[PDB]
Here is the input.
Amino acid sequence: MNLKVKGARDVFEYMKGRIPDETKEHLFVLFLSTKNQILRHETITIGTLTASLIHPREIFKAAIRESAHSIILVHNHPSGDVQPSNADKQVTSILKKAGDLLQIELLDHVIVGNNDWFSFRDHALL
Here is the structure.
């Protein structure tokens, strides 16, 4: 059971086969227990990532309902460069401080693509 998240790599592996259409951009939120066990995940956006499509209210209602301890954000890039856009970095800002507010910490934001992933935390970017 690879459902315990120790690092970004575990997120990458968990999301394998879970992108509905890899040509489309998708935002996902994984809900983690106090022991970093992936409880479940939800599809936030399906579309192109604008910060206005993010409604902290919805994301965290599911978090609070699942009594998630923390959350991890996953973005796929159809293209294949897992480097983050400024749209990605804006949604990271608003969910980081909404999680701090609500004490449901944004542990990481991981961008996934073909064979490859990018961790915001690992690039001192969270």
